[PDB]
Amino acid sequence: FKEYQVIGRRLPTESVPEPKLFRMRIFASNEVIAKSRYWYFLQKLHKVKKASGEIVSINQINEAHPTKVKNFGVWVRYDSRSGTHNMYKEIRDVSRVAAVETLYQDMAARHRARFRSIHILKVAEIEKTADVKRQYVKQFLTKDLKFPLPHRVQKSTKTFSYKRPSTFY
Amino acid sequence: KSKNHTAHNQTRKAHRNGIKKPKTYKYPSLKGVDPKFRRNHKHALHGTAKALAAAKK
Amino acid sequence: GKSHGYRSRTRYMFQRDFRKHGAVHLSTYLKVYKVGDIVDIKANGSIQKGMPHKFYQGKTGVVYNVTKSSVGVIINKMVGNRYLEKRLNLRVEHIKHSKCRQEFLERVKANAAKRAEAKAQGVAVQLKRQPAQPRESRIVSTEGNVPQTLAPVPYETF
Amino acid sequence: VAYGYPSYSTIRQLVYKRGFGKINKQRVPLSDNAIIEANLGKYGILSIDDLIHEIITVGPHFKQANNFLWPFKLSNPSGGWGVPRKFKHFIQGGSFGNREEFINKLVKSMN
RNA sequence: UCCCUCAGGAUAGCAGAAGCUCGUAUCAGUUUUAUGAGGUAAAGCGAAUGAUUAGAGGUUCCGGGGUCGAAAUGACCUUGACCUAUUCUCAAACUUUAAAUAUGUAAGAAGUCCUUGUUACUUAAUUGAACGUGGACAUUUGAAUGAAGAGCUUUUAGUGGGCCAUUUUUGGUAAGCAGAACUGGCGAUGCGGGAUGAACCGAACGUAGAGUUAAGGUGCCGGAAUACACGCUCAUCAGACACCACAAAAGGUGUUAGUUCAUCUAGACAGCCGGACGGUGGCCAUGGAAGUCGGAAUCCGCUAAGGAGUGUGUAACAACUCACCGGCCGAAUGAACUAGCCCUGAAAAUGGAUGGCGCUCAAGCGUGUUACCUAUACUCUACCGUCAGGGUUGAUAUGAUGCCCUGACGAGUAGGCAGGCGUGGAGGUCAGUGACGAAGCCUAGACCGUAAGGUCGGGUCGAACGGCCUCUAGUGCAGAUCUUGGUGGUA
RNA sequence: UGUCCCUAUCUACUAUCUAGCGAAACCACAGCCAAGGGAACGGGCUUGGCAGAAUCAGCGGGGAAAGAAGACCCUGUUGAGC
RNA sequence: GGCUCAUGGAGAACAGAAAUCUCCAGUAGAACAAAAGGGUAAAAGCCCCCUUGAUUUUGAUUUUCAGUGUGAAUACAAACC
RNA sequence: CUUGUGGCAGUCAAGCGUUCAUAGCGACAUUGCUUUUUGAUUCUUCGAUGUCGGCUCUUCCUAUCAUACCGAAGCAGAAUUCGGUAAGCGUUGGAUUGUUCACCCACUAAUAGGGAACGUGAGCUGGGUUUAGACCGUCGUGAGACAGGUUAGUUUUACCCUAC
């Protein structure tokens, strides 16, 4: 995935000079998707479609600090089989994009919600700890954390072994 | 016991070798045009023929 | 049995129009039709003489004959795999002129004016029409237009 | 179909390797800028690079240069399409429709 | 379309062939620009027609009556007829409005502009109308794209049971049911895939090589990662790939994620144990009701708190006990919902099928990323053929129906046409072969031909037969419960 | 009164084996199942189960076994008796 | 050529729900031989005046369609009304 | 194929059952499952797949009548009823009827329901059905008709392969 700034305006028809330039923060694997999604969302907010408007700028946005561990509190909306539901999940990751693709995977895994049936309402980094709601994140926010990895499964590149392989670590 | 009517394959049949325009000649069908306009028009054209047969010198 | 009468399936089309009932307005009759003039076919149900078949309702032809209360129109009738030359005899309330051909016949004179002018001047006429060209390179200025960051909406009932 | 915006490089590679012309229809390989300036010298194009010019920059004789060029017979792509199933639209994770700049990559692979 | 038509025919269509007139035209199952037409989807009913629920207001003049001084063209009602402004929900045979997709026409030499000619038509007219004469404007010839040649004609085959699929759709509980609309398919179609399948997906096919892919997959069968990555699921009836070979409502403190509200410095949940009261026999109903027959009220006292009472108990009390707070403990809870995968719901007959095996941080489900395997598809090349456009015996001997150059193409039932193969005879020719062996037959021997077939060697045999150019036909067999004759397996 | 409860036993002639003589019906090719799909009930197809010469006497599940261009029903612009 | 129809409202002896009379509103809610739909308000409706275009001659055109017939219809032309 | 119809089975629970929804039942609704009925259809078969029932005989299904062991109760006992695992085990003798179906008598622990080409005709039987003879009733002028009644009415072949 990638995060893209998409500024589209509206078609400048004289009698209407300087249309109000609407910016988005689309999550998309390339520009051809990032611009198609831009139009999809702005067709749900304003009377304008790709014919009646124009993309004036598309610019990839990178991570401010792409090696600081961050608690991403993401607000999301998804079409279920029966209805639609607004969710709040908390990803812990190193980039906004890496956190979002983990959300898309853990939404697809836990509610069978595929790409077409998910809207990313917001992806806000949680400033101060004690604002982290979910325990599956508050686990990894404990002073002087350590934990083993029992049952270390090494993998051969050959069919036969001679040693009776161990699972120690 | 049978079936009755279908317009299935009838387009395909038509378009295979066909759908064609009627070719549009110059000097069109002057038939079913106002009879008294015709009756006169003859004498007009005969007059123009005599006038160019006079002009040829 | 089945019904295939002349004015069959024509409830709503030979219907008059909402608050446009009653009399035909006289411009209809004062209008002049000549041979080679392209005319529409649209029946006025209030007038039940020289009225066209529902097929020809909506069609456009060209006038071939002109007589007292009526014209004669040539229409293209596809039947199977080939068009025929269908000659109608229509009273003058069931037809009108085509702005189709009016906008062409004024473009001919606009081209004639452009060319006859630009023959004896600095020439860059390009008489042919071109479709909607891919828009040229413009600079969009953000002076009191600092883009509004839109976000998608949460779901709510009503 | 798949379509997009053909770069200079990709156009040059296509008209070089797969340059074929329509001459008395008989689809004839170019192989020589004499064969271009014979048929398209009327319109002022005298070379392979002059033809590639009148395409890459949409010329007054674009129609003529493009209709002269025979429909390119490309092969299937080099490393495949990516795309497990082609016949979805590119945006969905398919291949068909307008792939803006990614046509260049596809076409060189198909070349 | 028509027929005593419905198992059939004529008809038109689709088809083949023979060509022909000319040479990129003004053609196109297409778009654009302009200009029509439409009454379907949607919408509407405080808009008409029709349907339809609810009150409020006026009723006043009027259909039901006194309640009442017998009595009120009357004070209070239920009232029917209505009218007014609101209200809920609807319409294949309602409608103001009104799409999308389909659909008409135009986008120019047969064009435009300026003069002028006849005419028995028309005009009050010297005005028109139709057709012209004579001039003028061809770079942009008056949108895009294509064009494989465009137009024209004659003749004639087969067919006229069709069926299937997404979408629209009628009848019907429904159907692998009946009948429609547009398109695509099977029929008439092989090939790769869905294990298998007429119709699904992918791709349509001369003979080969090489390369690359489609749909589909890559544990083993089985070519191809027991690939990588984040989760979910444990089933004593798991699950496993669209058409497609099923499962529903309703449930689960199974487990995962989520939504809203409430409690926490002793929470509160726990989870054990102190009290649950005085006034007061609270009003009426009654032998009786006193906390619990109910119409209902609801205050206080010290108050840590306790309904003028949540359940057992009595004729009625009394009593035990619930909220309600509290001595104890010590850091998250209480519901009410929502959906994921499982589980219950879940019963049919021979033994049994995610294709089989098996698979449990999968070889399951959801999703992402690469790599990888392979179709008669795509690219390059060879060769075969067909078609098209060309060159060339120009003295130039060896083939002008010849040779050669260049390009594209190749599926096929019914059917058409063309080029050939084979048989009995016929005319001509090779001064053909032949008792030193014709023809016939036999041949896990050979060579030619895409093929029909041809040619040769070996054997047997013993009297005729062949190539080529033409003529002619009782001319080519696997089927007809074919004919005759012979032969079998059963035996 | 073995019709039956409920069967049993016996005799002759068969069958059986031999010498001799020696047919016919039928026969696309044939001959193992389960499911699957499929002209909706397979010997052959797909996926499994499996599978070892030559065979003899019985048997009546199957070969939609054999006998015959359904005689019932419909159609036919086919007839006949009445 | 004159007029306006349904229905409602207010009114005139017998006469009342209904006989006739008068005014006011009245987009058709009437009427037009029938089925249904369309059409129509100084009319296509209702009342009154005169007639016989419901006529002669044959052709072209539209619907059904093979672009055959039949039926029905259209628009002219030439006569006479 | 379908499941209207039939058969069986849930969900909700107004209520019936002194009191008491659910011990046992259950209205108004509503979701299924089955192919032991009957329809709907006409896909297979009209150069035939022998067309009802019974007799015999095997196997299978479970939607369990009995038996084994259990749970529930408006279960004191006995008796019965409602379920669970469960098809291992059995589930009859007769009167009338061709009947399948039905209806009685009697014993039994019980006399459950079904499928397997509505199992089973080269296995039988041939009462019924449905050829030709014949009688009656009603209908038809009549020939004749009747899914009305009645009586008489040929049940062929294995020696082949497979299976056993």
Instruction: Tell me how many degrees the CA angle C97-C99-C101 measures, rounded to the nearest 5.
Output: 90
Reduce the DSSP state of residue A60 to 3 states and report it.
Answer: strand
Contacts of C85 in chain B (CB under 8 A): 22, 29
SS (H, E, C) B5-29: CCCCCHHHHHHHHCCCCCCCCCCCC
Beta bridge partners of A61: A3
Q: Which of C92, C18, C23 is closest to C52 using CA atoms?
A: C92
| Cα–Cα dist A136/A91, whole Å | 9
Q: Nearest-CA distance from B28 to chain C in Å?
A: 9
Nearest nucleotide (C1') to the CA of residue C71?
G75
| Cα–Cα dist D74/D79, whole Å | 14
Q: Which of D92, D90, D41 is closest to D68 using CA atoms?
A: D41
DSSP B48: H
Q: For residue A50, what are the contacts with CB-CB under 8 A and spacing of at least 6? A: A39
Strands D20-22 and D27-29, sheet pairing:
antiparallel
Please count the other Cβ atoms lying within 10 Å of the Cβ belonging to residue A97: 21
- List the strands of the sheet with A118-125, edge to edge: A84-93, A70-79, A118-125
DSSP D89: B
| Cα–Cα dist B29/B24, whole Å | 10
Beta bridge partners of A5: A25, A59
Tell me which residue in A7, A18, A121 faces C154 most closely, judged by beta carbons.
Answer: A121
Nearest nucleotide (C1') to the CA of residue C44?
G39
CA of residue A88 to C1' of nucleotide E438, angstroms = 107
Q: Which of C121, C124, C93, C115 is closest to C28 using CA atoms?
A: C93
Please count the other Cβ atoms lying within 10 Å of the Cβ belonging to residue C56: 21
Residue D105 burial (10 A CB sphere; 0-12, 13-18, 19+)? middle
**H/E run at residue C99:** helix C99-118
Cα C110 to Cα A105, A110, C99, C123: the distances in Å are 64, 68, 16, 16
| Cα–Cα dist A76/A84, whole Å | 11
Tell me which residue in B15, B22, B37 faces C83 most closely, judged by beta carbons.
Answer: B22
Q: Which of D44, D51, D45 is closest to D14 using CA atoms?
A: D51
Residue type (1 letter), D51: L
| Cα–Cα dist C72/C52, whole Å | 11
Maximum distance among all Cα pairs of chain D, rounded to whole angstroms? 48
Does A100 contact C at CB distance below 8 Å? no
Strands C148-149 and C95-97, sheet pairing:
unpaired
User: What does the block give as tokens for A14?
Assistant: 């004289």
Q: Which chains touch C (3 or more CB pairs under 8 A)?
A: A, B
Dihedral of the CA atoms A147, A151, A155, A158 (nearest 10)?
Answer: 160
Q: Do chains A and D touch, with touching meaning 3 or more CB–CB pairs less than 8 Å apart?
A: yes
Tell me which residue in D91, D101, D102 faces A36 most closely, judged by beta carbons.
Answer: D91
Cα A91 to Cα B22, B51, D13: the distances in Å are 72, 100, 47
Q: Nearest-CA distance from A28 to chain D in Å?
A: 10
| Cα–Cα dist C128/C119, whole Å | 16
Dihedral pair phi/psi, residue C11, rounded to 5°: -70, -55
Cα C96 to Cα C37, C42, C62, C101: the distances in Å are 10, 8, 11, 12
Reduce the DSSP state of residue A45 to 3 states and report it.
Answer: coil
Best mutation site among C142, C155, C157, C158 for testing chain A: the one with the most A CBs within 10 Å?
A: C155
Task: Check if the beta carbon of residue D20 is closer than 8 Å to that of residue D28.
Answer: yes
| Cα–Cα dist A76/A121, whole Å | 5
Task: Check if the beta carbon of residue C65 is closer than 8 Å to that of residue C35.
Answer: yes
Task: Check if the beta carbon of residue A102 is closer than 8 Å to that of residue A137.
Answer: no
Residue type (1 letter), A164: R
Q: Do chains C and B touch, with touching meaning 3 or more CB–CB pairs less than 8 Å apart?
A: yes
Q: Pick left, alpha or beta for residue B7 (phi over 0 → left; psi -120 to 50 → alpha; otherwise beta).
A: alpha
C130-157: burial string, b at 16+ Cβ within 10 Å, e else: eeeeeeeeeeeeeeeeebeebebeeeee
Q: Say yes or no: Cβ of C108 under 7 A from any atom of strand G.
A: no
| Cα–Cα dist C108/C91, whole Å | 31
Task: Check if the beta carbon of residue A77 is closer than 8 Å to that of residue A84.
Answer: yes
Contacts of D102 in chain A (CB under 8 A): 30, 32
Instruction: Tell me how many degrees the CA angle D72-D78-D79 measures, rounded to the nearest 5.
Output: 145
Q: Say yes or no: Cβ of C145 under 7 A from any atom of strand G.
A: no
- Contact between chains at D99 and A32 (C-beta distance less than 8 A): yes
Q: What is the resolution of this structure in A?
A: 2.9
| Cα–Cα dist C60/A160, whole Å | 85
Reduce the DSSP state of residue D43 to 3 states and report it.
Answer: coil
Q: E strands of chain A, at which residues? A: 2-8, 22-28, 55-61, 70-79, 84-93, 118-125
Q: For residue C59, what are the contacts with CB-CB under 8 A and spacing of at least 6? A: C40, C41, C75
Q: Say yes or no: Cβ of C84 under 7 A from any atom of strand E.
A: no
Please count the other Cβ atoms lying within 10 Å of the Cβ belonging to residue D52: 20
Reduce the DSSP state of residue D54 to 3 states and report it.
Answer: helix
Residue type (1 letter), A135: Q
Helices D103-110 and D8-17: crossing angle, nearest 10°?
20
Does D32 contact A at CB distance below 8 Å? no
Please count the other Cβ atoms lying within 10 Å of the Cβ belonging to residue D95: 20
Q: Do chains A and B touch, with touching meaning 3 or more CB–CB pairs less than 8 Å apart?
A: no
| Cα–Cα dist D3/D90, whole Å | 10
Q: Which of D53, D59, D63 is closest to D15 using CA atoms?
A: D53
| Cα–Cα dist D56/D10, whole Å | 10
Q: Say yes or no: Cβ of C101 under 7 A from any atom of strand G.
A: no
Dihedral pair phi/psi, residue B23, rounded to 5°: 90, -25
| Cα–Cα dist A22/D12, whole Å | 39
| Cα–Cα dist A135/A138, whole Å | 5
